[PDB]
RNA sequence: ACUGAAACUGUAGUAGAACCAAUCGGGGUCGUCAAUA
């Protein structure tokens, strides 16, 4: 298997309700019908997790060696941004939202003739 | 065919009240490139 695949981003014209485009609930108050609060999550690794600290990357002959990123207690500092981006991309998939990061992609790509 | 004199433009008054330097973003990952014989 190729180590990547894709999740189809179905078009979303005519999608309605909470999966549609909607005005945001907002932050001004806790809405009577809408949930707020704390979710506690356990994350456990199944395969090893790379958390490279690019601030401490060391280079020889243009090759970069990364240590693990560690916190003020010397345990691995898994960034919440890295969790959030995993979670968001997973969320965007199963919810089929707009794709949050689409770069320009506005030039025609190129290929070579046989 | 005799200059008026003398008299503080001063006294009171907080450039201040309200306002989040903030919103979004996995330190990530695969096949291209060259054109002829």
| Experimental technique behind these coordinates | cryo-EM
Dihedral of CA atoms A82, A83, A85, A87 in degrees, nearest 10, equals: 170
Phi/psi-derived region of residue A61, left when phi > 0, alpha when psi is between -120 and 50, beta in every other case = left
Q: Helix or strand or coil: residue A93? A: helix
**Bases of strand B lying below 7 A from some protein CB:** 24-35
**Coil, strand or helix: which one is A53?**
coil
Distance between CA A86 and CA A45 in Å, rounded? Answer: 14
Cα–Cα dist A33/A110, whole Å: 51
Q: Are A89 and A82 in contact (CB under 8 A)?
A: no
Q: How far apart are CA A80 and CA A107, in angstroms?
A: 34
CA distance A51 to A75: 11
CA at A27, C1' at B13: how many angstroms apart? 43
Output DSSP code: residue A56.
Answer: G
CA distances from A21 to A3, A29, A50, A102 (A): 32, 21, 36, 18
């Amino acid at each position: 298997h190729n180590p990547y695949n894709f999740v189809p981003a179905l078009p979303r014209d005519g999608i309605t309700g909470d999966l549609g485009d909607c005005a945001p609930a907002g932050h001004s108050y806790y809405h009577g019908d809408k949930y707020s609060g704390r979710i506690a999550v356990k994350l456990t690794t199944v395969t090893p997790l790379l958390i490279p600290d690019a601030s401490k990357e060391e280079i020889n002959n243009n090759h970069k060696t990364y240590p693990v990123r560690i916190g003020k207690d010397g345990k691995p500092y898994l960034p919440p941004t890295s969790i959030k981006g995993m979670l968001r991309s997973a969320y965007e998939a199963v919810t089929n939202s707009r794709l949050a990061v689409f770069e320009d992609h506005d030039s025609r790509l190129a290929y070579r003739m046989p």
